Amino acid sequence: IKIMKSEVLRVTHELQAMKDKIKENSEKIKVNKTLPYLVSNVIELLDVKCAVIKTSTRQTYFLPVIGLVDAEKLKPGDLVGVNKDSYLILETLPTEYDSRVKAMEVDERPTEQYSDIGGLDKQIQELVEAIVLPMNHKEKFENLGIQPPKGVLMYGPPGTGKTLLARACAAQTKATFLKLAGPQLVQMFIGDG
């Protein structure tokens, strides 16, 4: 019967003291998290809990402590907003895609049936069986235990129908086509490509 009064009083007192002290600590952390958040990437994670961060200013700093996030929920390559000057990680950032990458996605879905391609029946069959057939089947390809090839290189003289076949494949597939060009992935800034 003593445990009622003694324990309830003590535990509620510790609850309230710890609660307002947690609110104080959280307020201090929030006010200390200066918003600018210089964006940086974790190039590697190493044990002492410590990280090597390459900032968007093209310079890499070692961090004696991780910061305000958890080291377990991190890996190489993640986007983290570090402090402008302290360079300490303040929060993790969701996967960010450049405007060029988003524009790279096919949204108009050009309409080109395979009937518009003449003289390439074997080539169309190879492309559809290497790029589309392993896509919407998958599990049965594993059932036969046969490895579907990872990539296809369409090569030949100009005007043979390479880009035409690619456009037709984008037309007659439900996959999210991601078109691009070689010169697109060439930029002034180091590491931009």
């Binding site: 324990e7 609850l15 710890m18 600590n25 961060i53 700093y61 070692f62 402590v65 302290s86 360079y87």
Partner: protein
């Protein structure tokens, strides 16, 4: 009244555990608050040792600074080339860091201490016997080699048809040791005249020596840089001088044949049909098949004379099986695949 006290104890224990979890969360908050005061440290490479207490460090994308160590750091760990973390204000070396894996080195530094049986590479018993006779004796017991006097067994040559299993030959020998097993095919050792050297001739022998024995295994040197005297000089350089930790060269391609320049040369025999059956067996293993299958007349009709031909016909029989729900490939299907490929290869 006992049940009332028991529900009381249940609630009070819940409150105690809640306080414990709150205490853990408060400790994490205090830990991150303490972590807040920490500041980053610039990353650089120690280029040179000026004195005991003076160092030369190059910031990754900064200038070169003359700096000194902190104090309680083992100065021997700071060789030229090591990665260190300078303080951001006094620029003193604070701690050392592992190197960061470099680009170029992806097939030059990867280790494969695997166990690939000679059954996987089928139909080449004589070649694997010869490879063992060449590599095992120097690696196993060099004491007899230094006793007789002849130190260097380097050289070797496996000319034959292209892509018939040259890599598997050095992979078959991987049954005993041969961990690093680098593949630097037609590149990064000569580059026409000299272009790749030292940093592209010596790191082979360094990363082999700092680990278990391996095979630089340069490949298809008929396409290096795409000059002869340069190759003559490169093979006659100090490569055979040190011969670190019994690492051999397993060149594969098509007075260069004397000792010290090229050791025993073996012609990879054209895949015999009686060996074609073994190749087709060990390639057609993983693909899901049926009981009535039989690999006897295929090699009779399949005279494509290439191992990759066998791999591709194994894949192409399955590719035929993709049409219709066939989870297994029938003998007629293999026959169709070979009568397709062995004739398509002619074009």
């Amino acid at each position: 009244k006992l049940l009332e006290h028991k529900e009381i104890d249940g609630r009070l224990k819940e409150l105690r555990e809640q306080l414990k979890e709150l205490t853990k969360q408060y400790e994490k908050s205090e830990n991150d608050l303490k972590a807040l005061q920490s500041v980053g440290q610039i990353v650089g490479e120690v280029l040179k040792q000026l004195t005991e207490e003076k160092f030369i460090v190059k910031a990754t994308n900064g200038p070169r600074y003359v700096v000194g160590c902190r104090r309680q750091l083992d100065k021997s760990k700071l060789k030229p080339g090591t990665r260190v973390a300078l303080d951001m204000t006094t620029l003193t070396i604070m701690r050392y860091l592992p190197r960061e894996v470099d680009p170029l080195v992806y097939n030059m530094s990867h280790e494969d201490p695997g166990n690939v049986s000679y059954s996987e590479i089928g139909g080449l018993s004589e070649q694997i016997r010869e490879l063992r006779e060449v590599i095992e004796l120097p690696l196993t017991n060099p004491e007899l080699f230094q006793r007789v006097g002849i130190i260097p067994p380097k050289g070797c040559l496996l000319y034959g048809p292209p892509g018939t299993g040259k890599t598997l030959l050095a992979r078959a020998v991987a049954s005993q040791l041969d961990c690093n097993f680098l593949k630097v095919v037609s590149s990064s050792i000569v580059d026409k005249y000299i272009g790749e050297s030292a940093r592209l001739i010596r790191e082979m022998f360094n990363y082999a020596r700092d680990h278990q024995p391996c095979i630089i295994f340069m490949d298809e040197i008929d396409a290096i840089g795409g000059i002869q005297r340069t190759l003559m000089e490169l093979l006659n350089q100090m490569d055979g001088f040190d011969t670190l930790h019994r690492v051999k060269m397993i060149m594969a391609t098509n007075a260069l044949l004397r000792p010290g320049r090229l050791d025993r040369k073996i012609h990879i025999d054209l895949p015999n049909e009686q060996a074609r059956l073994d190749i087709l067996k060990i390639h057609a293993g993983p693909i899901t098949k049926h009981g009535e299958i039989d690999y006897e007349a295929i090699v009779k009709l399949s005279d494509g004379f290439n191992g990759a031909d066998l791999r591709n016909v194994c894949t192409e029989a399955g590719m035929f099986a993709i049409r219709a729900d066939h989870d297994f490939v029938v003998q007629e299907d293999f026959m169709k695949a070979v009568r397709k490929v062995a004739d398509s290869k002619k074009l």
